[PDB]
Amino acid sequence: GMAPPSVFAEVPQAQPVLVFKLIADFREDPDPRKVNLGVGAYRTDDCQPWVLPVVRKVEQRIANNSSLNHEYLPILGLAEFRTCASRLALGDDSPALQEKRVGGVQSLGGTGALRIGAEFLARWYNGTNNKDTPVYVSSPTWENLNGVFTTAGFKDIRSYRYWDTEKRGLDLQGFLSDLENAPEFSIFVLLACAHNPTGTDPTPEQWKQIASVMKRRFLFPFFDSAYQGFASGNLEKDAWAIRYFVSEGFELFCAQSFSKNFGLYNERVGNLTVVAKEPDSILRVLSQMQKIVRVTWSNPPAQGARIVARTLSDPELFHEWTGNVKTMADRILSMRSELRARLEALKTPGTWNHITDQIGMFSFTGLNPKQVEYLINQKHIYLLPSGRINMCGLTTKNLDYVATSIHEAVTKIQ
């Protein structure tokens, strides 16, 4: 007479996600001095989200246009968006665009672009249905990257040396060694500019050395571009490495997000750019991408892509947008400069060059786990166990307290 057990009775509870608990603990913390350096998105000097002025303007124009309908977009997405997105990454004068050997697939953010690209490679790259091609990611890398490629079926995910704990910067020699030892045709996922989570990017000359090994060993570049514009407010200058690989003759993928540089996080706007050697393969590659998309999300949403396409295709809106991006980049540069200056004025042990040598909103500070625990529990400054901070969590009002607390952690803990 007993009720049968649920068909879900043996489904385990998934492991807790650290950063969600961190944000939860931050919000309940009563202390008026508390600071959230674990936030994952842009914030103003008043600790607020920022809807870009150009985005509000385009949203109003869309709302006032009654002729726009809601009929399905093409499987591959809105044509003007795909063209504009690939042109943003590659440059108007890209030889690959001139030679008609570029494809673009609209995707559900950068995540969706990585996922479709991984699914394609696991079916059609380095053989048919080859799940064994090594996929290399940086140590450390974006937190969801391993899961995307594992879910696409890749059985051999590897790391390359990248963050050097002692030097607080790039381990160039370790990275180059790991490239030299990678099996021919291995896939390397390369974060393009503003490395998340460390902030450490190769310089252009270091990128040339990386590219040289990849060219020689036939290693496939899969760029992940989520912060174009955050290094300088100059969208062209910030894409230098992707463009250098194109001009060196590489075929490559580039997963693009518009979540951060348009602030369109919750409209899920991305694009997968494909650069091929010959124009005829783009049609074939895209036909397979269509089949992958069809069984994942069918076709992509319109609102965010419409905003991006309208902005990138109109000179006036494009100029306003580049100014909005520069506002974000400049605030981050300011917080980096101000934090470093204060840490040095307090004569904090260690070197702090990395605070301004790093690029973008995320910084590996070099603080150890015990020091992170001190900052959270004693000073109410919330950050990840890795020592990652978001520079947008710093403000004119909290900078002295944050710098003083870091000085305490460095001198009194460990």
Added chain:
Amino acid sequence: GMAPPSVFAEVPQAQPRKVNLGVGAYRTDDCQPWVLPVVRKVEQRIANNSSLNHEYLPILGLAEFRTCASRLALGDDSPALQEKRVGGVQSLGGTGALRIGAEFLARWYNGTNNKDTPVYVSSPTWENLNGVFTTAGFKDIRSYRYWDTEKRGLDLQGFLSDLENAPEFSIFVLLACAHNPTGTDPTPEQWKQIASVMKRRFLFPFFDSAYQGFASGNLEKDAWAIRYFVSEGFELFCAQSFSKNFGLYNERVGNLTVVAKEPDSILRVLSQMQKIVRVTWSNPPAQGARIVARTLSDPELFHEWTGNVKTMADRILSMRSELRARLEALKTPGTWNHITDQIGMFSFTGLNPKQVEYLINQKHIYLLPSGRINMCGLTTKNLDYVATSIHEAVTKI
């Protein structure tokens, strides 16, 4: 030889008076798309609300959308809702809900990583269903009898026999109403017979509710089968789309409703769904879900929306009654009760593949080799031409 070979060199090219009856979306009597009045109203309200930001939604989606969507499927006073044993995952349309549900089952249902559980779909069914379940890893996709070509209706005895012969715990994907592509639905009495076998043989119902409201013009009636299975104690999934009943095709608004025996199972299931979503689309878009949540949460807007849905369903009913009457007035061979017995946007005309070619080649009327037409492609202006061209097709080829 000259250059390094392309890494894409071996990628295959994937396989591929006038009236258009091949459309798959609602169209007006003037052959135009229709943004629903309630949707325009809510869009203007959203555009006027400057407090809305663009920060990421939760992985599982906007909470009020998930609650309102599951309530639409299950009913506001569903015992499963009052007992707190329902979960909802916002998804990228109905397709995304089906995919997330398939990924979950292929990992956690009927064992761990059991890719061998049979997955049954109707003959015929929605053309993308096989691809969704195959991509999730299922190796054994089967069909159950459904369309009876001779009777032009449901082959109940074949369906029941295929249920009886299905291995215990097999998954059945059940189109909940307004069957795509046949327009043939089980009656409530037939649904009860289907449920009885599934209960006895532990068969898992995976409902697909993409046309709630189009079957009858009434959202409550069209969800009856889902709610009946809930009342019979089933655990189940229901993949919901808002593409058709809100006309929000290109905003990709769906929800996966999960019904379990108890609340703790919902918590564990949702925790695994979060992992699946995170590596597929990260978190879902806001615009379409905000429109649906705003509409369903406001009794005034809900009422207006149900009126908009009934306008669409009534125009379809008009086209069905007209086409059958005009065909029967022309003394067309065969019975044509199925044109009005069928339900939803589509009709399996019962027209053989070689009468299709005539309609396309000789009379410029476009439809699928299966004989499916979208009733939203018929208008007051083309009805007499289509009914005459079908008359000729049947009396001639």
